Amino acid sequence: YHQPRVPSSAIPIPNVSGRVPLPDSTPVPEDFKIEIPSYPYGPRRVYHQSNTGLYGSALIRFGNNVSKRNEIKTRRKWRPNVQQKRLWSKSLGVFVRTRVTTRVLRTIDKVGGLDEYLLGHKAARVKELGPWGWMLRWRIMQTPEIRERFAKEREALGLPPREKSLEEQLREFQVAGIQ
Amino acid sequence: EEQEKEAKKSAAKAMLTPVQEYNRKQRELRRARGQPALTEEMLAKIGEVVARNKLG
Amino acid sequence: GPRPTMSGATRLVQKRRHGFLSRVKTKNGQKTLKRRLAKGRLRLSA
Amino acid sequence: ATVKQHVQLALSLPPRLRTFLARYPPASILPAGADPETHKTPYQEESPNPFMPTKHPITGKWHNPKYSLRRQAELVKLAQEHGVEELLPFTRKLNEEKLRKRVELGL
Amino acid sequence: ASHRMRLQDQGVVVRLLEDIPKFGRKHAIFRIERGRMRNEWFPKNKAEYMTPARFQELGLTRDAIGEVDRSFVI
RNA sequence: UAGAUGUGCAUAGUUAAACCGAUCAUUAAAAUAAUGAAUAGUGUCUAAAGUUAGACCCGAAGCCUGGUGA
RNA sequence: UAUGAACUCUUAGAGAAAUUACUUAAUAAACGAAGUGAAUUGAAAUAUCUUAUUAACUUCAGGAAAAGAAAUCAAACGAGAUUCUAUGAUUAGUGUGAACGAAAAUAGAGCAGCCUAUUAAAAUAAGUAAAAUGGCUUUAAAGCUGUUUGAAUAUUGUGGG
Ligand SMILES: [K+]
Ligand SMILES: [K+]
Ligand SMILES: [K+]
Ligand SMILES: [Mg+2]
Ligand SMILES: [Mg+2]
Ligand SMILES: [Mg+2]
Ligand SMILES: [Mg+2]
Ligand SMILES: [Mg+2]
Ligand SMILES: [Mg+2]
Ligand SMILES: [Mg+2]
Ligand SMILES: [Mg+2]
Ligand SMILES: [Mg+2]
Ligand SMILES: [Mg+2]
Ligand SMILES: [Mg+2]
Numbered sequence: 001y002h003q004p005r006v007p008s009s010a011i012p013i014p015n016v017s018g019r020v021p022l023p024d025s026t027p028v029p030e031d032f033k034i035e036i037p038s039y040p041y042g043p044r045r046v047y048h049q050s051n052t053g054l055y056g057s058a059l060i061r062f063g064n065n066v067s068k069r070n071e072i073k074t075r076r077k078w079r080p081n082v083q084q085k086r087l088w089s090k091s092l093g094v095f096v097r098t099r100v101t102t103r104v105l106r107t108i109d110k111v112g113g114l115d116e117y118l119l120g121h122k123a124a125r126v127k128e129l130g131p132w133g134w135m136l137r138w139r140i141m142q143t144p145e146i147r148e149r150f151a152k153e154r155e156a157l158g159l160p161p162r163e164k165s166l167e168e169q170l171r172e173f174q175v176a177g178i179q
Numbered sequence: 180e181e182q183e184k185e186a187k188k189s190a191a192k193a194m195l196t197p198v199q200e201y202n203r204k205q206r207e208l209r210r211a212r213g214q215p216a217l218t219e220e221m222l223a224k225i226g227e228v229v230a231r232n233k234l235g
Numbered sequence: 236g237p238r239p240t241m242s243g244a245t246r247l248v249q250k251r252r253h254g255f256l257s258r259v260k261t262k263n264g265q266k267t268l269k270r271r272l273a274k275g276r277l278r279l280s281a
Numbered sequence: 282a283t284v285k286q287h288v289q290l291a292l293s294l295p296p297r298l299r300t301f302l303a304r305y306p307p308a309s310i311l312p313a314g315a316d317p318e319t320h321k322t323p324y325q326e327e328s329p330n331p332f333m334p335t336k337h338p339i340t341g342k343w344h345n346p347k348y349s350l351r352r353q354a355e356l357v358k359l360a361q362e363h364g365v366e367e368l369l370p371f372t373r374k375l376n377e378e379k380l381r382k383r384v385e386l387g388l
Numbered sequence: 389a390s391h392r393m394r395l396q397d398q399g400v401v402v403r404l405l406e407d408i409p410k411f412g413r414k415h416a417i418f419r420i421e422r423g424r425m426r427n428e429w430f431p432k433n434k435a436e437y438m439t440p441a442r443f444q445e446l447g448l449t450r451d452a453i454g455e456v457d458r459s460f461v462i
Numbered sequence: 463u464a465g466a467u468g469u470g471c472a473u474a475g476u477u478a479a480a481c482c483g484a485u486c487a488u489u490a491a492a493a494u495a496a497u498g499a500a501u502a503g504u505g506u507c508u509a510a511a512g513u514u515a516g517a518c519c520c521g522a523a524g525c526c527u528g529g530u531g532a
Numbered sequence: 533u534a535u536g537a538a539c540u541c542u543u544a545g546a547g548a549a550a551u552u553a554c555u556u557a558a559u560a561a562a563c564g565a566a567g568u569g570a571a572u573u574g575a576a577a578u579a580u581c582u583u584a585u586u587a588a589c590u591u592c593a594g595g596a597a598a599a600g601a602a603a604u605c606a607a608a609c610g611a612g613a614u615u616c617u618a619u620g621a622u623u624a625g626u627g628u629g630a631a632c633g634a635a636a637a638u639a640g641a642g643c644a645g646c647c648u649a650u651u652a653a654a655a656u657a658a659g660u661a662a663a664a665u666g667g668c669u670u671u672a673a674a675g676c677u678g679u680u681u682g683a684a685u686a687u688u689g690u691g692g693g
Binding site for chain 1 (some may be wrong): 187188190191193194196197198199200201204
Binding site for chain 3 (some may be wrong): 541542547548549550560561562
């Protein structure tokens with residue numbers, strides 16, 4: 001989709017395919033690519049339309065059409081109620097455009113927002129995210145809000161405090177370009 | 180060619196949540212504890228129960 | 236009855252239609268090669 | 282000499298039984314003057330009874346027992362073949378517990 | 389009247405982080421339409437979703453949800 | 463050494479069915495009032511058979527799916 | 533038991549495979565799982581049904597794959613993961629019919645349990661269980677599922693069957 005530009009972040013919201021093309025203005029070293037970790041459960045072999053949106057666990061379903069009298073079976077299709085909405089992201093601070101079903105819109109409200117819906121670690125949720133939901137999950141992990149929220153949640157779990165982030169690399173390429 | 184595939188297979192470890200990283204740290208500590216052992220004194224006391232319930 | 240449909244036939248149209256490159260580079264052409272390769276054919280194409 | 286024969290009977294049990302007793306030793310086989318609470322096993326500290334469910338303190342959610350009801354019946358059946366059924370912790374699958382509940386309450 | 393009706397959503401529970409006129413005072417909990425909260429309030433940080441976790445941290449329970457006050461004045 | 467284990471058929475009939483039982487069922491209560499039904503099975507071989515599989519043999523036009531060819 | 537050599541194409545890119553141009557460029561079929569899914573045929577016609585969760589196609593994967601240590605079955609006694617074969621069974625049951633068709637259990641082949649899994653995985657699972665509706669499967673249960681809605685917190689009897 002045509003995503004807004006993050007207010008203070010060089011990194012753009014990933015593309016549907018996974019690529020993160022940087023603008024020509026941003027200086028990039030020779031052969032440098034922003035790669036997103038592979039989706040654990042891999043793409044969805046059927047209904048590739050769901051690999052580019054938040055479809056939860058809904059696919060296109062095939063069944064029969066039954067007549068009133070003779071009950072003659074004819075094959076038909078059931079399609080999920082797929083829409084295209086602009087969802088607010090507190091971490092990014094913009095309106096992430098995406099295709100989301102009406103059932104996942106109620107989940108975004110149930111958990112407290114898109115950011116809370118993308119950070120869920122339960123297996124049932126990582127499967128519902130899909131390749132696209134795994135790219136938005138990776139994106140909000142680069143923001144300082146989530147980075148400063150996960151660092152505070154590690155002090156409660158008795159974990160050592162946590163090397164260079166992706167935002168700094170792009171920042172250092174703008175300095176090295178002038179030298 | 181394999182070092183870039185094992186690093187590409189374990190590349191999602193930087194996307195872990197604080198809870199996931201906490202559970203993965205406990206297995207290393209739990210696996211390092213080992214298995215408890217039965218001392219000769221505890222084994223001798225178990226034999227009495229076996230003999231008492233088999234021979235009398 | 237049959238007709239003389241090979242009159243004026245050229246050998247450049249035989250490689251473009253039933254050639255080897257026309258089959259390895261197409262999804263349906265890999266089947267023909269694999270089918271003919273499983274049967275034991277020597278002349279997989281043209 | 283009798284003590285040597287006793288240790289040869291405890292080592293004659295299947296590894297499945299010895300493994301369970303090693304990490305869940307009852308107070309009976311513990312040292313004479315030992316205290317049940319002290320010198321607990323790392324497995325015992327997680328849950329006193331592996332067969333009963335436990336409510337995690339931090340998160341108000343019940344954790345499944347380490348051994349499922351099916352596995353609870355395989356240990357009781359294997360423990361009863363070597364006369365070590367008096368060492369397992371309380372279980373609904375125990376032969377004496379099944380019988381006591383029937384006589385006490387009935388159908 | 390009937391023994392079964394059309395299933396309807398009653399709204400989402402939110403706690404106002406500001407003091408929006410014509411709805412309620414600050415820190416007011418009530419059920420609002422999903423459209424207004426999703427498109428107008430949540431982006432502007434005017435309210436927040438009252439998830440079960442939020443209820444625990446704030447010490448309140450599910451029996452504290454109020455009603456919308458259309459007559460409210462600043 | 464010792465103990466147990468492994469389809470099945472028959473040994474009891476009667477009724478829609480159970481209870482019941484050398485008796486049972488109908489008779490809205492039952493009852494020699496009336497009527498019907500009671501006694502060698504089982505395994506194997508040889509052969510002839512019913513049933514399901516292509517099913518004694520040969521033969522369509524056509525239907526569907528996947529590919530080929532201007 | 534070691535050892536020298538082992539060309540070109542399929543198989544860099546292009547192309548009319550065994551050429552070009554480069555270079556220490558390289559992996560068929562059958563078998564497996566999911567998705568999609570007919571018709572001939574039988575019913576002496578034919579629509580439900582049957583043929584058939586079949587053939588075929590598509591994707592993905594390994595030498596095998598899948599499945600798997602019970603929210604399983606039993607019935608007041610108890611059994612104790614998955615997979616393969618036989619019996620149970622031309623049975624229960626379903627269906628106007630034609631026909632379709634289990635499970636417990638038993639025997640054999642194998643046998644292994646676990647989360648500290650012997651390769652690195654839970655802080656015990658919520659838009660989930662479930663309900664209405666449209667379908668699949670099916671015996672009306674259980675199971676799968678698009679749409680609209682939507683729970684509870686352990687034998688001190690919470691949750692599923
Ligand atoms: K699609
Ligand atoms: K012709
Ligand atoms: K059902
Ligand atoms: Mg011509
Ligand atoms: Mg509404
Ligand atoms: Mg009889
Ligand atoms: Mg070449
Ligand atoms: Mg080539
Ligand atoms: Mg007829
Ligand atoms: Mg029948
Ligand atoms: Mg649970
Ligand atoms: Mg359901
Ligand atoms: Mg029920
Ligand atoms: Mg259920």
